[PDB]
Amino acid sequence: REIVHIQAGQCGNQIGAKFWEVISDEHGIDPTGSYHGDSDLQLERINVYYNEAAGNKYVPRAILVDLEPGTMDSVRSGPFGQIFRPDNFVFGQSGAGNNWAKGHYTEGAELVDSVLDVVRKESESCDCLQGFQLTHSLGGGTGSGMGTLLISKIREEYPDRIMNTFSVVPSPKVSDTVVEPYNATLSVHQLVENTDETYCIDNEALYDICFRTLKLTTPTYGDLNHLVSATMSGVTTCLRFPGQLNADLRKLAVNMVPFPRLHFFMPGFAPLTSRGSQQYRALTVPELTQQMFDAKNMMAACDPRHGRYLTVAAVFRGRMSMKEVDEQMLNVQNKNSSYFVEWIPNNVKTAVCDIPPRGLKMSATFIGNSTAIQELFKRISEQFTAMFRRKAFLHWYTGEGMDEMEFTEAESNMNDLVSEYQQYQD
Amino acid sequence: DLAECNIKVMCRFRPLNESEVNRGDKYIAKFQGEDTVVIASKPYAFDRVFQSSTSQEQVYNDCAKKIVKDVLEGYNGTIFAYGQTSSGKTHTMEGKLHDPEGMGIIPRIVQDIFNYIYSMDENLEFHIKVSYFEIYLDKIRDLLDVSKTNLSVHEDKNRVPYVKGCTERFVCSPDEVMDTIDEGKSNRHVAVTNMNEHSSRSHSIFLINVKQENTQTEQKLSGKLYLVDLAGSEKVSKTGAEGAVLDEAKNINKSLSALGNVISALAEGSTYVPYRDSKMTRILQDSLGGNCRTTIVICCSPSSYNESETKSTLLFGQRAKTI
Amino acid sequence: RECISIHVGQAGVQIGNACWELYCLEHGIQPDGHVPRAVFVDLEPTVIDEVRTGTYRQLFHPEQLITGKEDAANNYARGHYTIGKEIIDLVLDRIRKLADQCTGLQGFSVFHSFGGGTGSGFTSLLMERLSVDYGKKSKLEFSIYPAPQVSTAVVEPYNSILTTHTTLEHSDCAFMVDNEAIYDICRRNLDIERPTYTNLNRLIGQIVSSITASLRFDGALNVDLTEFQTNLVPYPRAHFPLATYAPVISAEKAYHEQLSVAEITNACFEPANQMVKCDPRHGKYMACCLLYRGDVVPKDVNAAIATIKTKRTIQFVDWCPTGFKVGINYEPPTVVPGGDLAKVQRAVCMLSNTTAIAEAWARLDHKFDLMYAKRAFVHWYVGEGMEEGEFSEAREDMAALEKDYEEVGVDS
Ligand SMILES: CC(=O)O[C@H]1C(=O)[C@@]2(C)[C@H]([C@H](OC(=O)c3ccccc3)[C@]3(O)C[C@H](OC(=O)[C@H](O)[C@@H](NC(=O)c4ccccc4)c4ccccc4)C(C)=C1C3(C)C)[C@]1(OC(C)=O)CO[C@@H]1C[C@@H]2O
Ligand SMILES: Nc1nc2c(ncn2[C@@H]2O[C@H](COP(=O)(O)OP(=O)(O)OP(=O)(O)O)[C@@H](O)[C@H]2O)c(=O)[nH]1
Ligand SMILES: Nc1nc2c(ncn2[C@@H]2O[C@H](COP(=O)(O)OP(=O)(O)O)[C@@H](O)[C@H]2O)c(=O)[nH]1
Ligand SMILES: Nc1ncnc2c1ncn2[C@@H]1O[C@H](COP(=O)(O)OP(=O)(O)O)[C@@H](O)[C@H]1O
Ligand SMILES: [Mg+2]
Ligand SMILES: [Mg+2]
Ligand SMILES: [Zn+2]
């Protein structure tokens, strides 16, 4: 099987560097080097993310889409930056304006064809394609607009292969941009109707989880990114490993989406202990479920405790008892019968790889489909209206060839999306 | 908001055809009352059950007459023809377009709209516009303009959905409308190698927008009536190229499943209805559920051979649990 | 004389590798000896690959190892219809190529995992295409039906109410081994909270060895495969008996091993030892096939059983005077060199049809409804060549399996 990553925008891009920083080491691939793999198993399934050309050069099969040179020229001028074949860099030296409209209708719409071109060169690579990974932020141009287009096109070209989306939904407390809800509401819209698996991460849900669950005092972006990339590795790549009970994107999809919206999840990693001290090793297993299922530790902003779950997928990856795994999951399902929805006898989807995260003994990625994420699109949707009402920075959109009915559309859509999700919380 | 889920379901059985009789099929449908059919001992009640010799006139009076009045009253509505291929969907929705006896629901509706208009003609100023498009593989094509392919649904300033760039034609007489339907039917063959295959796998959607303004009263009215001849509900038996002696791969049509979820949601009195599940349900959003009347005519072959398919159809129709 | 076997689904393959292991182990045929007599099917390469990479690597022909690089999908539909279809032909070909090479066979021991994609769906049509190509044989399918509370897949029931209805009208005798109810045995009758799947497999890998292996093997009271279905199914429904083993004692902890027949047989009817969460909560047995192996005196049995026949609290069906097929083999069991199985010199792999499953099916059917009641993951099948029909019409199916398993018992 296979997949083809997609680094839309700067963020989605910045993260690319971290997702590939990791993944590679979790596959023994040095900058341009080959497979130094401490083992021999980190190779029989690599294909999922690379391509064979030389014999020591397995190149990441991702796409780097962005209308701001400097960015990709920071990712390509640093560490692992020199492993991507230049063909991968689909830049847009234009003005990468922070407008969803500027990267979806006017500026991005041009650079698109020169992207799809490659997304096809990579898809028609070889063997059988599974789906595409998509990273980006719903709070900017090259991210929400142009990346949200990249998919609307992808999903017309292969409505068969899957589409996981890793979105950095606009954090609450403080917005790292101003129109944010504009660029956001507009991209979520596109998401709820193309990709079929979305993993929403919040820069501040991370800080928290990174400053209190990792006594880490100076959580640089690199970190946040790093933590995130840690989860997306547990998801995909991982399951493309052996296991007593293994799954793969689809299983994950076909066990997690009760209703076609596409629904968004909230990823959570397992061993998340501070370096030295904490290295408690309390990782027998009840310790991992202890972790994963708590409020804090959910990369999302919202707290599960604020709304039932529809599905859950503990994708563990480290030798354990299909008994102490299958078992724990249960008590968990009974101690919290309250929030776990009922019309699904077994919400949880236990998954079990074998080999764990390179240096760790036992981990377990968590992919939750809780109704709690209602209280986020609400947020976003609110911010919109409060500012849409006055058409705040709307001239930067319309003036870029947009529509007063376009914004209406998205909000509503994504706004209805909130509605539905409640239809199950009850 | 009127009653929430103003969905009526009528089951129409057609006569056994010569192919079924030739095959040796038997008539398995048993009837009771004017609303119940019995298949394999199990009873299925609906708003009405039409036996094999019911007339086009009976079907129109029971299934569409009142909806047409609502449209002229200024409300929206939808009427569907659901069922396996050869069940009687097209016969029901259009029949013989120009035969006064054999014409289906659409011809009779057009006829009644204009006739009503003619009896008004005093202070009311009418304006009728039609649209004719099809959905194949969840892609919309304009049947009035074959260049308009893979169109997209959009919502206007006031939330009302619409097919971006879809031809809207002003009609002034029944004959103009039938000519429009005839053109759409001819245009449909464009870029289609097998029309049988294509017709059974696609959805035809005819829209009649009736606007009126009383020059004196000034009160304006606008109603949209969507007439839909759905794709065959029988996914099974897909012949062709695939796993020769190893196949069973095919899903229920995306729009039919989307329609199922929308109807079930409305039947449950849910405040959230999943219209976005398909382009079809999104376009029909302002005319399906809510304060709109909706009639679904599920059509069935009374053949022993199509027993399992009929069960499915009956079950689909049941999604709208009435009282 | 023989009995081919088709291990379908990752699980049916893991269990397969296991049951297949125990085999050579008690037949003195190391890694590289003769030639198996089965096949391996899966729509996820990486798993069958485990049989291509791991142990018992060269004991198979890359011909009896079928794979569909494509996608597994934890959904019946896709595995049965859409995808699974493409492979079937090829699959069959082997069970027609392997079925020919032999000499007057008896049937195909099928190994699948009820609630899976490749295991539920696929087989559904595999067994399907068999019942027609060899109606004149035995179709005993050995299943691992859904843990009563510890299921895995979110949809599981969808996949198991569908593998039951499609296979029902095609199997001869369906053996059942409950994944969870086996854990209990690993906790309560062996002590270990560290049971790897690789263990449950060693277990069924045992109970199964008692079925085919040893039975098709000479003895003082041989029992052919046909024998089963005959002495085991009272009615055409591909009736599902339950597998049970007796000396499930730990090869470390306790040691009373020397547990004469009189004991090991009583240890079969206590509900805490039956590889199935179908505790005889009321289910009246209606036929049991006590397969013994090792040093056993026929009188010991034709007495140990007599004592049972008169315990009454073990209530057998009415319309059944005597329902005890005593199968005696010679060669004692054969435990893994150093797993965790005791290693006695006699065992009792008793299987049976019990009005008990009236439960297990019930509890699994109900599940289904809850979700179907909301269509839950329905769009996943529809979009895979299925319809409101197959579900609703396979639900009605089992319905008459809840009435069937009710009527054939509880009444006199
Ligand atoms: C001596 C020793 O055992 O060191 C550990 C360690 O101290 C701890 C604290 C690690 C450490 O992780 C962090 O401090 C961290 C920093 C930024 C963001 C997130 C986490 C570690 O850096 C991370 C590193 O993780 C791995 O090696 C995994 O394979 C992981 N790899 C990466 O994230 C990675 C990092 C740099 C370069 C390339 C990859 C992984 C996880 C999931 C999927 C794929 C890969 C491990 C075990 C450790 C150190 C090295 C200190 C922990 O994290 C992980 C992801 O394992 C933090 O809590 C856990 C518990 C570990 O015990
Ligand atoms: N006893 C036993 N049960 C197993 C084993 N592997 C899986 N199972 C059980 O069988 C079911 C899992 O089926 P999956 O592995 O998801 O799927 P599959 O049937 O192989 O086919 P796909 O869904 O297409 O992958 C669960 O109920 C597991 O508890 C095993 O090795 N032994
Ligand atoms: N986790 C994370 N968030 C980022 C990174 N870079 C920008 N962001 C977030 O992305 C949003 C800004 O969008 P940006 O990526 O600049 O848009 P674009 O570059 O025009 O497509 C803010 O909410 C930031 O917190 C990053 O490297 N990691
Ligand atoms: N009620 C009916 N009376 C007589 N013939 C019928 C009846 N319904 C269907 N048929 C005929 O059966 C054939 C197939 O019916 P049609 O409506 O085209 O099927 P579909 O459901 O595929 O649209 C047509 O000739 C049609 O006129
Ligand atoms: Mg037709
Ligand atoms: Mg599998
Ligand atoms: Zn002793």
Side-chain angles (χ1 to χ4, degrees):
Chain A
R1 309 190 190 209
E2 295 174 51
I3 301 180
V4 311
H5 177 242
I6 291 185
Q7 322 192 314
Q10 174 193 45
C11 171
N13 204 180
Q14 292 261 299
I15 290 177
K18 318 308 173 187
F19 162 66
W20 294 104
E21 244 180 62
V22 184
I23 241 191
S24 57
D25 148 297
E26 179 190 49
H27 273 294
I29 278 163
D30 299 292
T32 301
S34 63
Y35 180 67
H36 273 47
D38 316 300
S39 62
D40 353 298
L41 185 72
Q42 298 180 49
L43 187 67
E44 301 182 295
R45 210 93 160 73
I46 46 172
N47 305 314
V48 181
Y49 286 131
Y50 302 68
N51 278 312
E52 304 182 304
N56 163 81
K57 308 170 187 181
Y58 290 154
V59 291
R61 190 164 40 198
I63 309 181
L64 323 205
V65 212
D66 211 319
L67 319 154
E68 181 196 309
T71 302
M72 296 198 282
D73 285 60
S74 70
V75 167
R76 78 168 81 200
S77 67
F80 300 68
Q82 303 184 305
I83 187 176
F84 303 68
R85 295 286 83 174
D87 322 63
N88 284 179
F89 307 117
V90 171
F91 57 1
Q93 192 163 54
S94 314
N98 192 186
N99 210 41
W100 188 90
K102 200 166 178 187
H104 196 301
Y105 297 69
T106 307
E107 306 303 355
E110 68 185 350
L111 190 56
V112 183
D113 302 325
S114 67
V115 177
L116 303 190
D117 195 311
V118 208
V119 332
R120 296 185 195 178
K121 176 187 182 175
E122 300 293 54
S123 59
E124 309 279 300
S125 62
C126 245
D127 213 53
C128 182
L129 172 72
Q130 168 91 317
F132 328 69
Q133 314 273 321
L134 179 62
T135 80
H136 64 313
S137 73
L138 288 35
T142 15
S144 54
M146 183 221 242
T148 207
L149 174 58
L150 282 13
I151 50 99
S152 301
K153 288 286 70 177
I154 295 311
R155 253 270 201 162
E156 179 195 320
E157 182 56 54
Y158 342 65
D160 262 278
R161 321 306 178 177
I162 32 274
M163 277 302 292
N164 298 53
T165 286
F166 283 90
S167 78
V168 177
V169 170
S171 4
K173 48 179 68 176
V174 168
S175 293
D176 303 307
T177 281
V178 200
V179 286
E180 193 95 68
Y182 271 166
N183 317 307
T185 285
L186 291 191
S187 52
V188 56
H189 184 37
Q190 239 76 35
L191 300 173
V192 84
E193 287 275 60
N194 290 323
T195 234
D196 58 282
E197 287 169 300
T198 338
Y199 314 83
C200 2
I201 308 173
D202 310 353
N203 303 307
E204 107 254 295
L206 267 44
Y207 288 164
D208 149 284
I209 301 172
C210 185
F211 124 79
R212 73 135 68 179
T213 308
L214 271 62
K215 308 176 184 178
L216 195 50
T217 304
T218 58
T220 302
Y221 257 124
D223 305 20
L224 287 218
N225 285 37
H226 174 315
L227 149 149
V228 163
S229 33
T231 291
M232 77 177 333
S233 26
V235 186
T236 306
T237 165
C238 170
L239 266 183
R240 301 327 160 70
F241 269 155
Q244 313 292 23
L245 185 87
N246 65 66
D248 73 273
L249 292 198
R250 290 168 191 291
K251 308 246 302 182
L252 277 65
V254 193
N255 272 289
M256 300 215 301
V257 294
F259 304 96
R261 291 336 301 258
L262 121 57
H263 293 196
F264 319 62
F265 319 139
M266 323 196 291
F269 198 71
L272 237 9
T273 67
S274 51
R275 196 225 171 158
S277 66
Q278 197 54 12
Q279 150 234 172
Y280 226 83
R281 331 269 230 187
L283 298 180
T284 300
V285 156
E287 301 90 354
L288 279 64
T289 72
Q290 156 71 58
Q291 192 105 59
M292 318 195 313
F293 276 93
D294 193 340
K296 37 289 175 191
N297 213 230
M298 286 299 275
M299 295 180 177
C302 63
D303 28 79
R305 207 182 188 191
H306 236 158
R308 313 266 189 302
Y309 282 72
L310 303 197
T311 271
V312 170
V315 188
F316 303 80
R317 65 200 306 281
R319 257 264 158 53
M320 61 212 298
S321 142
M322 262 49 265
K323 149 77 178 183
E324 59 177 44
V325 184
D326 267 299
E327 164 177 299
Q328 216 60 198
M329 307 313 272
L330 180 57
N331 299 176
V332 187
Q333 274 203 65
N334 295 293
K335 281 187 184 176
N336 312 288
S337 69
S338 191
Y339 41 68
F340 230 138
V341 101
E342 299 166 63
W343 44 279
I344 305 187
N346 193 156
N347 315 292
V348 196
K349 202 296 159 289
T350 276
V352 166
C353 166
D354 266 313
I355 163 172
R358 212 315 212 170
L360 201 52
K361 170 175 183 176
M362 175 191 293
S363 69
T365 314
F366 176 78
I367 314 181
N369 183 179
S370 52
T371 54
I373 212 177
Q374 160 182 294
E375 283 210 298
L376 170 119
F377 290 150
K378 249 180 186 59
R379 200 62 175 189
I380 307 285
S381 203
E382 158 63 62
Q383 305 189 320
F384 205 78
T385 48
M387 77 168 32
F388 191 50
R389 174 49 190 171
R390 304 303 205 75
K391 313 226 167 305
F393 319 82
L394 204 152
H395 91 293
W396 284 119
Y397 290 82
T398 296
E400 283 300 305
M402 188 95 319
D403 330 300
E404 189 83 62
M405 183 54 215
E406 190 45 39
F407 286 59
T408 289
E409 182 169 300
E411 165 148 59
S412 303
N413 172 187
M414 186 253 289
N415 197 60
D416 126 301
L417 161 61
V418 157
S419 149
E420 171 265 82
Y421 245 136
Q422 191 158 294
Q423 312 284 77
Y424 300 111
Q425 208 166 48
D426 250 286
Chain B
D1 315 313
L2 175 58
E4 218 299 308
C5 179
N6 305 30
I7 310 186
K8 287 190 172 176
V9 180
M10 291 78 173
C11 182
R12 183 182 192 189
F13 272 86
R14 62 158 174 71
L16 274 179
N17 67 52
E18 199 282 316
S19 319
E20 297 173 321
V21 172
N22 164 241
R23 186 190 293 129
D25 304 358
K26 298 176 191 62
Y27 199 109
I28 59 171
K30 277 70 184 181
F31 304 85
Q32 283 169 209
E34 56 99 274
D35 51 26
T36 304
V37 54
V38 174
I39 302 295
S41 308
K42 187 189 178 306
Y44 304 83
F46 297 99
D47 287 74
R48 198 150 303 150
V49 175
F50 302 118
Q51 291 192 52
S52 300
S53 295
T54 305
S55 71
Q56 297 286 64
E57 176 78 299
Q58 291 176 255
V59 172
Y60 175 81
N61 295 135
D62 299 335
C63 307
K65 193 84 174 189
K66 284 190 179 184
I67 288 176
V68 178
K69 179 49 184 162
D70 294 314
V71 175
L72 290 162
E73 205 81 59
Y75 304 120
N76 294 345
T78 28
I79 298 171
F80 298 84
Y82 181 102
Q84 66 173 143
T85 296
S86 299
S87 61
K89 296 184 295 301
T90 308
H91 175 92
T92 298
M93 285 305 305
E94 59 187 43
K96 287 198 180 69
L97 296 179
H98 295 100
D99 190 317
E101 293 279 84
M103 61 176 167
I105 290 171
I106 299 176
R108 301 174 184 276
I109 286 185
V110 172
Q111 188 176 60
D112 279 340
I113 286 183
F114 283 101
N115 287 346
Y116 171 94
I117 295 177
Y118 300 152
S119 300
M120 305 313 308
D121 292 344
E122 42 208 295
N123 306 270
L124 289 173
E125 175 60 71
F126 298 82
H127 285 302
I128 324 305
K129 312 156 209 62
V130 298
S131 296
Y132 197 14
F133 56 95
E134 65 168 349
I135 296 177
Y136 185 51
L137 305 177
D138 209 51
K139 268 67 173 66
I140 308 168
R141 177 173 67 156
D142 197 340
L143 293 187
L144 266 31
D145 182 352
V146 301
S147 71
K148 305 296 182 68
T149 49
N150 197 15
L151 303 175
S152 53
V153 189
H154 292 67
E155 281 65 70
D156 74 348
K157 169 180 54 62
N158 49 293
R159 182 180 172 185
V160 180
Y162 67 82
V163 183
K164 186 68 181 65
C166 195
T167 305
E168 296 186 354
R169 204 178 284 181
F170 289 93
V171 292
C172 301
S173 66
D175 294 342
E176 281 184 52
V177 183
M178 298 305 106
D179 290 339
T180 299
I181 294 188
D182 286 311
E183 179 197 335
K185 294 160 59 199
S186 42
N187 283 157
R188 205 176 205 198
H189 295 85
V190 174
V192 165
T193 302
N194 187 325
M195 193 76 246
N196 306 151
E197 210 268 9
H198 182 82
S199 287
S200 67
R201 295 183 179 258
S202 51
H203 313 87
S204 286
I205 304 173
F206 194 80
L207 175 278
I208 302 181
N209 179 205
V210 175
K211 289 175 170 284
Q212 53 189 302
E213 180 269 341
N214 187 302
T215 49
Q216 312 303 317
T217 311
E218 284 203 29
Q219 265 71 296
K220 281 183 160 57
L221 286 177
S222 174
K224 281 152 65 172
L225 216 191
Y226 283 89
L227 298 322
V228 191
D229 184 355
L230 303 164
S233 56
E234 77 310 319
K235 54 179 182 177
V236 68
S237 302
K238 183 171 184 171
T239 43
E242 225 297 289
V245 69
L246 209 295
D247 185 70
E248 70 305 287
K250 177 161 169 50
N251 306 331
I252 285 174
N253 177 269
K254 185 173 186 178
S255 291
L256 295 185
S257 64
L259 185 59
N261 280 310
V262 165
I263 294 161
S264 295
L266 288 164
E268 298 174 6
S270 176
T271 48
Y272 173 103
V273 191
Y275 297 108
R276 212 91 188 199
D277 285 2
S278 70
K279 290 183 167 72
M280 185 188 299
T281 50
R282 270 177 51 66
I283 304 159
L284 298 172
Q285 172 156 3
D286 73 340
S287 311
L288 169 51
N291 310 35
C292 313
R293 315 311 170 302
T294 296
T295 294
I296 296 175
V297 179
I298 59 173
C299 311
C300 309
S301 163
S303 179
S304 55
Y305 201 71
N306 296 111
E307 191 175 71
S308 42
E309 267 304 333
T310 296
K311 291 169 188 152
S312 315
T313 294
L314 297 171
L315 293 174
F316 175 94
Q318 283 182 339
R319 292 178 174 259
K321 285 80 182 179
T322 58
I323 288 177
Chain C
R1 180 206 300 184
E2 282 180 65
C3 177
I4 296 183
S5 31
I6 44 192
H7 310 80
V8 67
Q10 170 178 71
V13 170
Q14 313 190 63
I15 181 192
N17 197 81
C19 143
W20 229 252
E21 174 165 50
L22 192 74
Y23 275 3
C24 76
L25 181 56
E26 73 192 316
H27 274 171
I29 288 181
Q30 298 156 295
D32 298 296
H34 176 186
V35 166
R37 340 205 284 277
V39 310
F40 292 99
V41 198
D42 189 7
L43 315 184
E44 202 185 23
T46 302
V47 189
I48 301 303
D49 259 55
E50 296 311 299
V51 181
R52 286 180 167 177
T53 289
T55 330
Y56 298 74
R57 200 188 75 68
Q58 255 297 296
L59 189 59
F60 305 85
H61 283 40
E63 306 158 298
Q64 43 182 282
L65 284 159
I66 273 62
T67 68
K69 65 176 173 292
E70 298 163 308
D71 327 59
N74 276 186
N75 82 321
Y76 173 76
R78 180 164 169 60
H80 180 105
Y81 296 68
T82 273
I83 183 165
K85 231 304 171 186
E86 274 181 48
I87 319 304
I88 200 300
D89 278 288
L90 179 53
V91 188
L92 271 198
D93 246 313
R94 300 296 173 298
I95 66 191
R96 286 162 63 193
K97 246 180 171 57
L98 239 178
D100 223 299
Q101 155 187 168
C102 60
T103 355
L105 66 163
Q106 185 62 282
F108 338 78
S109 62
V110 173
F111 286 101
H112 74 309
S113 303
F114 251 51
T118 297
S120 63
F122 177 91
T123 339
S124 295
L125 63 49
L126 180 73
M127 285 232 67
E128 209 283 69
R129 267 232 168 187
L130 294 172
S131 297
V132 186
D133 203 302
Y134 309 71
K136 188 189 198 170
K137 300 245 170 259
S138 279
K139 286 134 281 161
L140 277 67
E141 70 196 69
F142 206 127
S143 58
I144 288 173
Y145 137 2
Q149 289 185 58
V150 193
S151 82
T152 294
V154 189
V155 291
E156 173 119 298
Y158 274 164
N159 302 310
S160 49
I161 285 301
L162 286 174
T163 321
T164 197
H165 131 293
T166 193
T167 206
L168 190 55
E169 315 298 61
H170 293 231
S171 196
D172 283 39
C173 197
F175 293 115
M176 311 187 296
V177 139
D178 191 316
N179 190 9
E180 166 161 44
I182 282 184
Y183 275 150
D184 300 313
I185 308 170
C186 305
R187 183 239 305 280
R188 306 171 54 186
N189 286 193
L190 191 34
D191 197 294
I192 27 181
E193 306 288 49
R194 184 262 179 196
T196 307
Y197 255 160
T198 205
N199 285 317
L200 309 182
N201 296 313
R202 301 190 151 302
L203 196 38
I204 341 303
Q206 190 63 64
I207 183 288
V208 177
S209 178
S210 88
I211 302 311
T212 302
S214 68
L215 205 37
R216 291 268 129 153
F217 167 2
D218 301 60
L221 205 55
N222 283 301
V223 199
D224 190 304
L225 281 188
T226 7
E227 297 249 320
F228 286 69
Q229 64 189 201
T230 313
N231 286 268
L232 272 193
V233 335
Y235 305 100
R237 308 305 284 199
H239 278 194
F240 333 53
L242 336 173
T244 301
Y245 198 85
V248 287
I249 170 262
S250 42
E252 275 234 322
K253 253 93 194 201
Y255 269 142
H256 182 296
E257 320 137 355
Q258 287 273 47
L259 200 39
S260 75
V261 176
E263 301 78 75
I264 64 175
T265 292
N266 184 13
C268 279
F269 302 85
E270 50 181 30
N273 211 81
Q274 41 184 61
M275 313 202 286
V276 98
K277 185 81 174 182
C278 191
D279 323 296
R281 170 178 174 173
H282 73 286
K284 302 173 164 32
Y285 285 81
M286 43 192 116
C288 325
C289 181
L290 283 151
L291 293 177
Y292 290 63
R293 61 188 322 177
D295 289 308
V296 185
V297 171
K299 199 250 184 302
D300 281 342
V301 206
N302 217 287
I305 281 177
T307 214
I308 313 301
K309 189 60 182 181
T310 51
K311 236 172 180 176
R312 282 306 191 167
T313 314
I314 181 185
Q315 183 179 46
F316 273 83
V317 188
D318 242 306
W319 48 255
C320 190
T322 68
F324 265 93
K325 212 292 143 181
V326 176
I328 292 177
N329 292 324
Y330 198 95
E331 184 156 306
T334 308
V335 175
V336 179
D340 281 304
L341 344 172
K343 171 48 187 173
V344 190
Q345 298 221 317
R346 79 179 101 209
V348 172
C349 28
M350 92 92 56
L351 32 76
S352 71
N353 196 176
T354 70
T355 294
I357 300 292
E359 286 301 68
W361 281 143
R363 296 293 155 56
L364 192 97
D365 173 355
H366 187 283
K367 249 169 179 48
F368 186 99
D369 291 315
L370 289 190
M371 295 172 315
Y372 188 64
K374 288 185 178 181
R375 306 287 134 168
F377 324 76
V378 156
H379 84 289
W380 276 124
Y381 300 100
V382 193
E384 310 301 301
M386 289 265 289
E387 323 86 303
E388 178 259 51
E390 254 307 61
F391 288 74
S392 281
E393 317 263 274
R395 176 55 186 76
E396 286 184 59
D397 190 325
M398 274 213 107
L401 192 49
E402 161 204 6
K403 306 186 192 306
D404 165 296
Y405 266 177
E406 184 106 74
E407 292 178 58
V408 185
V410 184
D411 206 59
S412 57

